[PDB]
Design a protein around this ligand. Structure first.
Ligand SMILES: CCOP(=O)(Cc1ccc(C)cc1)OCC
Ligand SMILES: CCOP(=O)(Cc1ccc(C)cc1)OCC
Lengths: 330, 329
């Protein structure tokens, strides 16, 4: 029935057009509070985010899922304020990414489970704001710690009904190892979204996961250093495949009958401290439409390539509603 | 003239007996706010700290230096509240230890200098509370990033007069490489305290740095896993040297004419999430006196060993005052 947002619970019908993998800011635990000037100022950052969210809203976007975890420097008060100002629903996350501090790294699977449930049931910090999704990540073979995270995510998800979303090194087929772990925990593939999936050209790897019931996240659409090949850091981060190439993978899965398994996003942000300095400048040049890139550019492109409008609606409205809706096992 | 504390500035005379390397809680950036229950509750942690601090105060302690950096999970609001409640002065720190997040790891020396100056001049977070010391760390051969930290710490120190205090792998003689970098930045050894120095028996190493004008921090006095050796984790962390063995290093240095360069502490805490679970329990059992260990146990021991009381007063009152006073070159 309900999905938790930074402003409280909403009905499924209110979610509307939803972007499933985004961020307001990409940072580190405690960073925004300790060194806000890094982003100009907190106020500057929020203003930027409000502007961008209002542009997306104008394009039809009603809800965004900010997959920033504790270690991505998620600031739930920042999220609640921009959500309120832009009038865009924002779903917050729990989980752990690739930069856990010692206090997290030394924890057992049981303790991590506890922390995840806490964020989901009790709320984040002392705000009472509850997480609506669990974010995990691997980059190649899972380290022993990552395996604990994955198990903990599965158990919290089994207890709550809240979905799991991941970061993958698609090219290395991480999705298959993640699936194996999740399944070993009893987790249903339909509660899981294997992200950054458009980062690969191997459709066989994709279709195989889709066939198992997993959701495939094609969330790096606008990421391309194409024409920027002169920037080591940019090219390393964004890649050299064109946005068109990534978008056609959406059509490809549709064509194979997996429309119900597709989730699309931009993986955008408004501030980014966990990388080289001034990186935002480059991204903003690369994708001036920011989070509105999907509705403004991708939808129309697909339409033109022959994808029927309703299919497009099912992908951006229906699939996400199903995914987000907390669902308990048999 | 004045030293910055979490409740504001104090004059040097007001510092009195000062513990130079301690912590209220050993954690990680954002952890306390995100998972306070890991420590029972924020309240419980706070109550535990107030009692401990009141007990040290009863023993004569007037000021403590909490060397918790951003990456140690320093919560200045927590510090301000326990300080007020126990009536003990608390000096806060800036710097970086060994668990910096990516957002910090990717910064240049210039950016890091700016961040340290911010905490010292403008204040921590939005509190307006200013740091009165810079904490840095190495663990054997410095890493490239650690070299950047040390240089930025040096620069912030040269611009503000605030001292620098370090964590070393004493056994590995880290202090030597630290000194080299600081000196390469033009920093006076007298603005530096090389910590965890009682972690080693090498007096040759210690008198060498002392002879150079550096302050020697003997702050692991009560750390010992003797009898607790059935515990790998505790042993790894505490070592197997007795507190008396560490305490005698103090007497040794005094004997060599380095009384003015010694700074003693306990390196205690009331919460500890950055290690194995339940480690506190073990520590509390090893040193039930907590921060009062120094005045209750060490001072009398040294006295009994022949050290003059006045000397003891110089080490615990005079030395720290001089070290802490912001001093420009
Ligand atoms: C099904 C009718 O679309 P929708 O409910 C949400 C929606 C808006 C824009 C696009 C491109 C797709 C979906 O329209 C809102 C006014
Ligand atoms: C000179 C007298 O020391 P002091 O100023 C601070 C002080 C107290 C106790 C000990 C063990 C050392 C130093 O005593 C005030 C109570």
């Amino acid at each position: 029935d309900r999905i938790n947002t930074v402003r409280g619970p909403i009905t499924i019908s209110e979610a509307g057009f939803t972007l499933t993998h985004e961020h307001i800011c990409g940072s580190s635990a405690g960073f925004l509070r300790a060194w806000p000037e890094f982003f100009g100022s907190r106020k500057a950052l929020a203003e930027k985010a409000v502007r961008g969210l209002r542009r997306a809203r104008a394009a039809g976007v009603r809800t965004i899922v900010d997959v920033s975890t504790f270690d991505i420097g998620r600031d739930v008060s920042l999220l609640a304020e921009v959500s309120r100002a832009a009038d865009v629903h924002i779903v917050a996350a729990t989980g752990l990414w690739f930069d856990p501090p010692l206090s997290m790294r030394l924890r057992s699977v049981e303790e991590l489970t506890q922390f995840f449930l806490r964020e989901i049931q009790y709320g984040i910090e002392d705000t009472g704001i509850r997480a609506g999704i669990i974010k995990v990540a691997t980059t190649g073979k899972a380290t022993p710690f990552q395996e604990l995270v994955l198990k903990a995510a599965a158990r919290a998800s089994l207890a709550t009904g809240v979905p799991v979303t991941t970061h993958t090194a698609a090219s290395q087929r991480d999705g298959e190892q993640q699936a194996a772990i999740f399944e070993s925990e009893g987790l249903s593939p339909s509660r899981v979204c294997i992200g950054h999936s458009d980062d690969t050209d191997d459709l066989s790897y994709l279709t195989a996961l889709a066939a198992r019931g997993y959701l495939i996240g094609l969330d790096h659409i606008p990421h391309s250093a194409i024409g920027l090949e002169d920037n080591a850091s940019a090219s390393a981060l964004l890649g050299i495949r064109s946005w068109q190439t990534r978008a056609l993978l959406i059509k490809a899965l549709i064509d194979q009958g997996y429309m119900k398994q597709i989730l699309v996003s931009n993986d955008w942000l408004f501030g980014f401290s966990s990388y080289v300095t001034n990186i935002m400048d480059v991204m903003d040049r690369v994708n001036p439409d920011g989070m509105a890139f999907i509705p403004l550019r991708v939808i129309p492109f697909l339409r033109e390539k022959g994808v029927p409008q309703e299919t497009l609606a099912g992908i951006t409205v229906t699939n996400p509603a199903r995914f987000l809706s907390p669902t308990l096992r048999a």
